[PDB]
Amino acid sequence: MRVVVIGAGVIGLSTALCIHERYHSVLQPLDIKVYADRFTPLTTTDVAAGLWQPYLSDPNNPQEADWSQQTFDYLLSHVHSPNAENLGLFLISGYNLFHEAIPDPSWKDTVLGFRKLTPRELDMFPDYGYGWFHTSLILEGKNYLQWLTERLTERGVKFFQRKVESFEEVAREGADVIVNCTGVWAGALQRDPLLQPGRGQIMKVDAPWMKHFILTHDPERGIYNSPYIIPGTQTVTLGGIFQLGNWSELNNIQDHNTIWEGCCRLEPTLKNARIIGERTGFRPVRPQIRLEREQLRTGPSNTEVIHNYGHGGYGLTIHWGCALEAAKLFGRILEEKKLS
């Protein structure tokens, strides 16, 4: 069975690894290749801080809540492992701040120690009257892509740098199954008017006294259009930009100033922090993830496709449950191939 995974961000690499681990067998070996136009450190996944946190609103597809919890439980089970440093995986606590009262999120029982903030805690944040505290996990995107890449490479998965122009192009080279993990660019291989870029910009700063994340919200202005601060292993991410429809892969000074001034109002100690770097990326925004099989006609043959794209601002948070779901769909293909 020749499988091609298109895409080498967290979704494509985790899906490739899950297909291999579940379905590369002694009596049915797979040949798996990854085709991608960009690899680490140059994907969207590489821009993400990697905090596990779904959106505040309930997902349109309720299975996505399961996939996020599966990812959390999976990662939590390994956070105290000696492997965790190579994954970029660690525990972190922090604040979610609101102007006024809001209902609890659906994921409040997935994270550890979820509670409302107390009055004395809220006194630390002059602009916010309500919020949460909990403990979650960070899975840093660059690190984890590097780790996934090493695991794939040691299992014989080969990687090729190319921009694919069509599913037919890949089918003509002999793929029996294509897994489409192309993030925000999926529309170029098959039009999808529900998929749009949600452009974000972040700054990385040296602020090693910051031991908590701090996410603020202004839901009417949209998720992530409010300051956020997320300590990583080496540096702290500052952000708070979400611009639907904007395809400019270029840091801009207006968004720089929005991020800096908003995060320094939130946390005045950041005025002393050295700015290390700045990045832009495109969240693959869709009303729900597209995670589903399709049969495509590709010249003289049909080809099986699994789509796995549209993970918005939560691709690291949900990737493992999606990758397991994609591998289940792959097993349905194999079961049907026996019954030819």
Ligand X SMILES: Cc1cc2nc3c(=O)[nH]c(=O)nc-3n(C[C@H](O)[C@H](O)[C@H](O)COP(=O)(O)OP(=O)(O)OC[C@H]3O[C@@H](n4cnc5c(N)ncnc54)[C@H](O)[C@@H]3O)c2cc1C
Binding residues are: 8-11, 37-38, 43-45, 49-51, 53, 163-164, 182, 224, 228, 283, 312-313, 315-317
Segment 217 to 246, residues that bind ligand X, using CB under 6 A: 239
| Binder of residue 37, out of ligand X, a copy of itself, none (CB less than 5 to 8 A by kind) | ligand X
Q: Residues 1, 43, 59, 98: which binds ligand X (CB under 6 A)?
A: 43
Cβ distance to ligand X smaller for residue 170 or 333: 170
| Binder of residue 8, out of ligand X, a copy of itself, none (CB less than 5 to 8 A by kind) | ligand X
Query: Applying CB under 8 A, does 118 fall inside the site for a copy of itself?
Result: yes
**SS in 3 state form for 192-230?**
CCCCEEEEEEEEEEECCCCCEEEEECCHHHCCCCCCEEE
CA–CA gap between residue 198 and residue 155 (Å, rounded): 34
Q: What separation in angstroms does the CA of 27 have from each of 24, 118, 295?
A: 9, 59, 25
Instruction: Find the part of the chain contacting a copy of itself (CB under 8 A) among 26-34, 118-126, 278-286, 306-314.
Output: 118-126
Closest CA to 192 of 305, 315, 326: 305
Alpha carbon dihedral 120, 121, 125, 127, in 10-degree steps, equals -70
Query: Applying CB under 6 A, does 44 fall inside the site for ligand X?
Result: yes
How many Cβ atoms are within 10 Å of 126's Cβ, its own excluded? Answer: 9
Query: Applying CB under 6 A, does 47 fall inside the site for ligand X?
Result: yes
Asked if 15 contacts 23 with a C-beta cutoff of 8 angstroms, the reply is: no
Segment 130 to 189, residues that bind ligand X, using CB under 6 A: 163-164, 181-183, 185, 188-189
Query: Applying CB under 6 A, does 70 fall inside the site for ligand X?
Result: no
CA–CA gap between residue 252 and residue 240 (Å, rounded): 13
Query: Applying CB under 6 A, does 315 fall inside the site for ligand X?
Result: yes
Residues in the chain: 340
Closest distance of CB 87 from a copy of itself, Å: 10
CA–CA gap between residue 117 and residue 106 (Å, rounded): 17
Q: Residues 266, 316, 323, 327: which binds ligand X (CB under 6 A)?
A: 316
| Binder of residue 50, out of ligand X, a copy of itself, none (CB less than 5 to 8 A by kind) | ligand X
Query: Applying CB under 8 A, does 274 fall inside the site for a copy of itself?
Result: no
Q: Which residues does the annotation place in the binding site for D-serine?
A: 224, 228, 283, 313
Query: Applying CB under 8 A, does 176 fall inside the site for a copy of itself?
Result: no
CA–CA gap between residue 135 and residue 65 (Å, rounded): 18
Going by DSSP bridges, is the β-strand pair 177-180/2-6 parallel, antiparallel, or unpaired? Answer: parallel
Closest distance of CB 312 from ligand X, Å: 6
Cβ distance to a copy of itself smaller for residue 212 or 293: 212
Closest distance of CB 146 from a copy of itself, Å: 16
| Binder of residue 12, out of a copy of itself, ligand X, none (CB less than 5 to 8 A by kind) | ligand X
Residues 6+ apart with CB under 8 A from 283: 44, 184, 197, 198, 199, 200, 242, 312, 313
Residues 6+ apart with CB under 8 A from 119: none
Residues 6+ apart with CB under 8 A from 97: 117, 125, 128, 130, 131, 214, 215, 216, 217
Closest CA to 6 of 139, 210, 163, 129: 163
Instruction: Return residues touching a copy of itself (CB under 8 A).
Output: 80-82, 84-85, 90-93, 112-113, 115, 117-118, 120-121, 124, 133, 135, 208-212, 231, 233-234, 267-269, 271-272
Instruction: Return residues touching ligand X (CB under 6 A).
Output: 6-12, 35-38, 43-45, 47-51, 163-164, 181-183, 185, 188-189, 200, 202, 239, 281, 283-284, 309, 311-317
